[PDB]
Paper text:
[name], a bifunctional enzyme, catalyzes the final two steps (reactions 1 and 2 below) in the de novo biosynthesis of UDP-GlcNAc from acetyl-CoA, glucosamine-1-phosphate and UTP, While the N-terminal domain of [name] catalyzes uridyltransferase activity (reaction 2 above), acetyltransferase activity (reaction 1 above) at the C-terminal domain requires the formation of a bio­logical trimer. UDP-GlcNAc is an essential precursor for the biosynthesis of peptidoglycan and lipopolysaccharide, which are constituents of the bacterial cell wall. [name] consists of two domains: an N-terminal uridyltransferase domain with an α/β-like fold and a C-terminal acetyltransferase domain that forms a left-handed parallel β-helix structure (LβH) with the shape of an equilateral triangular prism consisting of ten turns.
[name] crystals in the ligand-free state were grown in VDX plates (Hampton Research) by the hanging-drop vapour-diffusion method at 277 K against 1 ml reservoir solution consisting of 25 mM MES pH 6.5, 1.8 M ammonium sulfate, 5% glycerol, 5 mM MgCl2. The [name] crystals belonged to space group I432 (No. 211) and contained one molecule per asymmetric unit with a solvent content of ∼82%. With one molecule per asymmetric unit, the monomers from three neighbouring asymmetric units related by the crystal threefold formed a biological trimer. Although [name] consists of 495 amino acids, a model could only be built for residues 1–472. The extended C-­terminus present in [name] [name] was not well defined in the electron-density map. The biological trimer found in the current structure of [name] is similar to that in the [name] homologues, except that the active-site residues 398–403 are disordered. Therefore, it appears that the tail-to-tail arrangement of trimers in the cubic form results in a sparse packing in the cubic crystal form of [name].
Residue numbers in the entry:
A (entry chain A), B (entry chain A), C (entry chain A): 1 to 145, 152 to 165, 167, 179 to 198, 208 to 397, 405 to 473
Write the structure that this text describes.
Amino acid sequence: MTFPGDTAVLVLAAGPGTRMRSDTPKVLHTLAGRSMLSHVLHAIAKLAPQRLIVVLGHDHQRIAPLVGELADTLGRTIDVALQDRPLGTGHAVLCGLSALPDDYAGNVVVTSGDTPLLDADTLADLIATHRAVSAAVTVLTTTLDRILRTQDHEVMAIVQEVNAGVYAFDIAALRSALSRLYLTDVIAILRSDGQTVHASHVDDSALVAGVNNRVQLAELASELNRRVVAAHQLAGVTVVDPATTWIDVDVTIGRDTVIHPGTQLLGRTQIGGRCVVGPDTTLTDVAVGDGASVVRTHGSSSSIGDGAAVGPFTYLRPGTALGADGKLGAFVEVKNSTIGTGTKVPHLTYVGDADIGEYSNIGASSVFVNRTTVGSHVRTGSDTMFVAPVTIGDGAYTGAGTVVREDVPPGALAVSAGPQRNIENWVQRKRPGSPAAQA
Amino acid sequence: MTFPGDTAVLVLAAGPGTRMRSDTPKVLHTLAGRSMLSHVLHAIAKLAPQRLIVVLGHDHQRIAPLVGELADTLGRTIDVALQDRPLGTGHAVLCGLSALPDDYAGNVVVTSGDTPLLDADTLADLIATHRAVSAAVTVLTTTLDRILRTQDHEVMAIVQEVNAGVYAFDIAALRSALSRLYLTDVIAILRSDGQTVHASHVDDSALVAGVNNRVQLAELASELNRRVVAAHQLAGVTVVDPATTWIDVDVTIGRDTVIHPGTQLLGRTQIGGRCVVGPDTTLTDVAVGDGASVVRTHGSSSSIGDGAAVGPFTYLRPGTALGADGKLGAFVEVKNSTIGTGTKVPHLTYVGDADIGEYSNIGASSVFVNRTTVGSHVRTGSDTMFVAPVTIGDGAYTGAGTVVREDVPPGALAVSAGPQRNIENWVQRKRPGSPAAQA
Amino acid sequence: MTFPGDTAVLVLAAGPGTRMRSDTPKVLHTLAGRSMLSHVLHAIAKLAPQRLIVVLGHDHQRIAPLVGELADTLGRTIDVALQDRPLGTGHAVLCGLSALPDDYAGNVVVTSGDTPLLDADTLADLIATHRAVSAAVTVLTTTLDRILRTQDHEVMAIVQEVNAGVYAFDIAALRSALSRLYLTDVIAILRSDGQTVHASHVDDSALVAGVNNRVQLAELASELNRRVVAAHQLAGVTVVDPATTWIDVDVTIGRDTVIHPGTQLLGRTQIGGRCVVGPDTTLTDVAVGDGASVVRTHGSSSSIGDGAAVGPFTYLRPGTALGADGKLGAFVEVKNSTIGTGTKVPHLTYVGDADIGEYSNIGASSVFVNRTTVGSHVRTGSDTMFVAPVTIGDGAYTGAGTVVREDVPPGALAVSAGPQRNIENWVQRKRPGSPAAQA
């Protein structure tokens, strides 16, 4: 388990986000599963400090996901700080210290909300470097392709090798420096006082990269995804095209699985072992069993059994539950319906609010009109209209082109189709030409 | 407004295009909306010179889009020059001067047709540099990863830092040099005469890049698209994957919109504000209202209302007009049909040549056979066959599995479905086994 | 024709593949059409040596595709070597020499099975370099962004410019060095003996790149595909997005064809001239005629005629045979069925195990239930159920919503649909409100 000593972490999410050009606040923008605020707060919760406070601008819209949805899921209390007037980064940290007690002793960690790739390891290295030299200020730094340097390689100040914006302060030195505006000046005053100033270098520049516009958001969204796709490949996932395959956080994929280009695994998608995920597939919070094929499928909040063939051209809606060895073929839509083990729903069908038994069959061009219940080993005919509610017994049959409105007994044929009538030489009388010649 | 002084621009599109390996001429190849000829002529029309002439090889196929479709849209007359025999670039410019009067005074700008990324700003900088030093010849140059240089950094000649192929001549010097073969020799003779030769450097190398093969066409097609996608992101468009998102010229996207990977916005596509464009979506000349969702849709020449849900698995055909809050669900095809405000067409449907009123409903597995008119607040049943023409009154109903051939009165049920008949113990007699046990 | 002198090639595919994290052996992993073993053995068969032997670890699963499927297709006998205990690369080559006669005279070529991009040209250059200097050992080398060097630029030894792992030995020197463990030591002993050691440099580093994990497999899968897509573009294929377009080996594309992003041409796909391949299209072993449009199609083992419109939203299954000018529209599924010349199957249809004549028409929302035969110039109505077997004569008709069970005579109407019945003011009595007001 990874954890620091006595530390307090301040999150700075008080920026207006004018460069984003959005009505929805900058820090609440989602990438690869979670929002930018969620990415920062999760990394700090991994190490778990003594205090965690977030500074906010327009707070009321941001105070809903924070504390309510974030702190309750993580399992620890997070405080909220309010900035009165946007003056600078130094004033924002001062507003974060107001929630902290006046007689606090532990270290202060300064972090930004618009840094989604910042993980626990980078934050743990900052605190470890801070304790080693016993410095008043420890700053994370990285190299690019704005840290000022003298002549004999020493740290001085920052002039928008580069400054990341992530800091580690001693509260005894931070309170004294802010009393005498930007946060970059705090380091300059501490240097003038003769305090130890240290710079910890991060080799991976993408971790401490900030987001100002939607270009930089997509630059890091493609970056964060690249690490996840590669991590599954090393674990045992055959990804054909990593550039088009999108995998969010918490998404788990099984051993020896093939994922084809254009696939988006979103939310909390679970994939079993030896699965063939086809091209152009979108899944969100969908559980997939072992050996199941998911080709060309648009799924959301669904469950697929072991060795089940889903697709192509399948649309799944919240509440879909396909069993083992069950088949969902082409042009099939399922909404809030439970499908049994070995049941095949192949051609041009819609199953809405229904329960189907084991090893049954649904006829082509059949729809469930809106609870309907179908038994086991039931072969329903093609173009079968289901007017809810209908209870079908086990082992029953249905004719081709049958409108079912009432209950069907176990082992009984349901028919309403009109018998075929042929009129010879009708084309020769009705049609003057075209398909009439020759007959 | 941007405009030069007294200038005449010559476009060189007389190349055979053997490297392209195409029956269709090189310069007529389209990328990101417009053709290569259209990209060049639009950039020159932005600044608008006194004269514009295009030199052509096989003219008759190229003279149709030029003058007829190009000059009429821009609003200014363009002349056509014909090359008798492909001798070189110097002879091609001489053929361009033949359309110009013998007593012309203004400057001559030389440009190539196979340079699609060449914009107005690069051409405006060339003329401004040409007027400043009062040079006889001004040439655009760029750096690569074939300009000849002496020893004290001076311009001499060109030996297939690099030559772009875009020139600015003084007509008094151009007419005199061509009288005494390639266009690169003209600069060499002017240098020997003692005339001022100037080179204007372009920092962006992609702007003056030429196309010889279909590889270079795709290299610049991915380049031109990269700038457009990024421009929308800075404006206020959340693009998930810029590499798979294709946006043509004239295509406008609204504020705070989400576009998912695999989306192609082609032609003159318009997107409103706060729209959710789903994965694998193709739209060409389709107008989309504010807050509308377009997921997994193949659209061409259509209109989508405000807050309307289109998709997934929807195919739109020229003449489709969906109103506000209207829903086009899964596996739906619409051809030349007007759909009212709040009308839902959800499952496995085809609406061809029909007019539907406000807040109506279309049953699942129903098709419009080929003008049909549906009223407002009309709930048509599932598997409803529409034999054109049918006029349905406001507030009417239709049964499940009904073939409608005649007009339906306002507030009237249309039924032709056969009633359900159940035969008990049919499976036990007809089938020897399988679903018979147990019943 | 390219061919070496007297040479024997040993393939080393005895690695366990623990880094792959797969139940299926490393060398049997497929990329861009063929497996890694198939890619190596095809390149050696192009030049065709006197002897070819493959060393294996767990042989019984790998001995099935090898010799049986590989040697029979190429047309020459390949031997199988078995490794008793994984000791090293030097022991693996010694196990390869056991299949060779004790009095063999020709050269020995050492190659790895996990090198898919290794072509015939790289192997031909190795043997040509080996014969020129008459060296005992000739090794292929490349530059990266582990060959040991002295001071005056000479070859010594290898310390996991770089070592590729591909060798060329003289059998008189190879047998003597292995008698006195890794294969890298063999070069070191030969250098100590005073034998000539030569290094042939390969400018293209991707050719001799090895695969250990699924990341490197995808790194070379995207690399190999990039060369193929570019090769078609130079030949005469307009590819919009090369990054998303996947083209396997043996796949041939015609002249002046347009391929849209998200297309996967797999197996032995054939494309005619002037074809428009739409976005999100997957084809495997599918033949496409000249001028045919394949948009948004999931095809496998099918045939498309000249100038035939397939798509969008079409799913093709093994046995599909569409003729010339035939149309397969939106939401159509075809399984093991022959479709005639000029036959249109447009909306929401399934054609399973059927034969349709020339210039016929299939109604919307119609399915073929399971051999069915349809004649020429036959216009079947919408929602037509086909209960196999049904023989339809030439020029026959079918009503809208007709269940066909028996044979239809040439030029005869088939009807089973119930006539429309209208009940006026039904909504006013049955429904208390909603669509009732106003009527």
